[PDB]
Design a protein around this ligand. Structure first.
Ligand SMILES: C/C=C/CC/C=C\CC/C=C/CCCCCCC(=O)OC[C@H](COP(=O)(O)OCCN)OC(=O)CCCCCCC/C=C/C/C=C/CCC
Ligand SMILES: COc1cccc(C(=O)NN(C(=O)c2cccnc2OC)C(C)(C)C)c1C
Ligand SMILES: [Mg+2]
Lengths: 249, 240
């Protein structure tokens, strides 16, 4: 029995998952309105998303007191957070590729080996989402000087959402999110004592992340890239069958 | 002990609760005017007519809000367009009756399960009722609710000319809510929890505001007549 804290969540970032089992959360599918010329690139990007979705489930599973939740609720929390947690990780990685400290940012870190260029997003018609990710999230967190402790705490608050529809034990999810609110306020008060609006400033990025996440689904569903009928089952099988994370000493 | 509320913050709280109570209920004179503009189409009319009236009350509340005059006219319309649907979700959720598990709007004829099922939007009311039950469990007083409403209006929206200015105005209401929760709870550790759960509503009303935009587009595709004031305030495209 361990305590849900920022210190434990920081240790969980070092753990790397073995994605030996792959689940097709995002796939091109038949009769795709994606032009065939760009169909192979979109499929590649979907397989990259699926890998990061799989590593996201392994991370959520080892969060303290997350396994003690009902398996129905564990599926619902990951089902309603994977898109927002993906964009939040993309924005966190994209902070390094920012221009300077009047041209808009041009690079976005899909993955450590990936940068999606702004012109490619404009051709795909997702340039508006592209810029919001880099401005409302990446650039704002650089201005807010967000460290990894606050970043991993916001990740837990995004996942542990008691307002998820269909939960069996809502109040069990509340206690975990309420504990993360206490951990976040304590870190903001001892580190940056002068900044008294930082606790709200960090949390004000979550509504911005939601609006961006919902807009991504509109493009994802318009191109029939999501298999929503099978996502709930993939998380169930990933929570049970995926191997424990590898550790870096 | 606990940092107290300043004279500016105590007056702002008293001002917000004062005017939000005046716009809780629509005016009887404006009640009959919006109906004279335009198979029964009665459930769809009552829901839209009450939405027009309540949105009009939201704009009047937002225009008389401290800081709304400091921003440009183009930024005023941008904030009014975005917060209209989301504040509507707070107005309706504020009138949730736990005993009957429904929305009691005194009129009690628009926001009902029966009118939404007859208007074809049977799936929508259950998503609204879930947000009503979730927000009802928070037990916000009129101060939490009024300060939250102002925080919604001065939120960072896409297409703002002066985002740094609106952010300073929003922070002026956030700190009022923060100190109010501190004095209310005697600086107990739970002050951040109550302050955090209120800020969590900002995230959830983004989804409901997005569902309203998708519903307005679906109604425009099915050739169902949406009122003109609601089509302009939310930028509903005349789509085929
Ligand atoms: C939150 C989850 C994140 C995981 C995202 C990973 C994979 C999902 C797919 C993402 C695609 C981003 C676009 C990358 C460029 C693709 C190559 C390209 O130039 O296509 C142009 C084409 C123009 O065609 P056309 O103009 O119709 O045809 C022209 C003539 N044939 O565009 C297309 O063919 C359609 C592409 C479908 C894009 C779906 C966007 C969904 C985005 C989700 C979140 C990511 C946001 C960052 C975006 C940069
Ligand atoms: C999740 O809840 C949703 C989701 C999607 C659409 C609606 C809706 O019914 N919206 N409409 C209203 O009149 C209305 C009623 C109550 C409150 N807010 C409203 O609008 C902001 C239409 C203009 C008729 C579409 C609602 C209530
Ligand atoms: Mg006022």
């Amino acid at each position: 029995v361990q305590e849900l804290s920022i210190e434990r969540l920081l240790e969980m970032e070092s753990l790397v998952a073995d994605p030996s089992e792959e689940f097709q959360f995002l796939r091109v599918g038949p009769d795709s309105n994606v032009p065939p010329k760009f169909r192979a690139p979109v499929s590649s990007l979907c397989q990259i998303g699926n890998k990061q979705i799989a590593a996201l489930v392994v991370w959520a599973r080892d969060i303290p007191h997350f396994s003690q939740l009902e398996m129905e609720d564990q599926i619902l929390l990951i089902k309603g957070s994977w898109n927002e947690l993906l964009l939040f990780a993309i924005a966190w990685r994209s902070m390094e590729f920012l221009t300077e400290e009047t041209s808009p940012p041009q690079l976005m870190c899909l993955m450590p080996g990936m940068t999606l260029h702004r012109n490619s997003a404009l051709q795909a018609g997702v340039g508006q989402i592209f810029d919001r990710v880099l401005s409302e999230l990446s650039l704002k967190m650089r201005t807010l000087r967000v460290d990894q402790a606050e970043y991993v705490a916001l990740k837990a608050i995004i996942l542990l959402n008691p307002d998820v529809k269909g939960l069996k034990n809502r109040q069990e999810v509340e206690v975990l999110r309420e504990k993360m609110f206490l951990c976040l306020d304590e870190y903001c008060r001892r580190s940056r004592s002068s900044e008294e609006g930082r606790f709200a400033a960090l949390l004000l990025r979550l509504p911005a992340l939601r609006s961006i996440s919902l807009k991504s689904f509109e493009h994802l569903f318009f191109f029939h890239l999501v298999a929503d009928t099978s996502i709930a089952g993939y998380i169930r099988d990933a929570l049970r069958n995926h191997a424990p994370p590898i550790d870096t000493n | 002990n606990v940092p107290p509320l300043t004279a500016n913050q105590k007056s702002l709280i008293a001002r917000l609760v004062y005017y939000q109570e005046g716009y809780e209920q629509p005016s009887e004179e404006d009640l009959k005017r919006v109906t004279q503009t335009w198979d029964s189409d009665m459930p769809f009319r009552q829901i839209t007519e009450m939405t027009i009236l309540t949105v009009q009350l939201i704009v009047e509340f937002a225009k008389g809000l401290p800081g709304f005059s400091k921003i440009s006219q183009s930024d005023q319309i941008t904030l009014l367009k975005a917060c209209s649907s989301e504040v509507m979700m707070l107005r309706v959720a504020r009138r949730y009756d736990a005993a009957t598990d429904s929305v009691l709007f005194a009129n009690n004829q628009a926001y009902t399960r029966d009118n939404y099922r007859k208007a074809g939007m049977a799936y929508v009311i259950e998503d609204l009722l879930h947000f009503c039950r979730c927000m009802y469990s928070m037990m916000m007083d009129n101060v939490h609710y009024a300060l939250l409403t102002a925080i919604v209006i001065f939120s960072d929206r896409p297409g703002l000319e002066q985002p740094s200015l609106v952010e300073e105005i929003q922070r002026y209401y956030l700190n009022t809510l923060r100190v109010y929760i501190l004095n209310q709870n005697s600086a107990s550790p739970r002050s951040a929890v109550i302050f955090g759960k209120i800020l969590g509503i900002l995230t959830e009303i983004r989804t409901l505001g997005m569902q309203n935009s998708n519903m307005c587009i679906s109604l425009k595709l099915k050739n169902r007549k949406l009122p003109p004031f609601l089509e302009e305030i939310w930028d509903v495209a005349d789509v085929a």
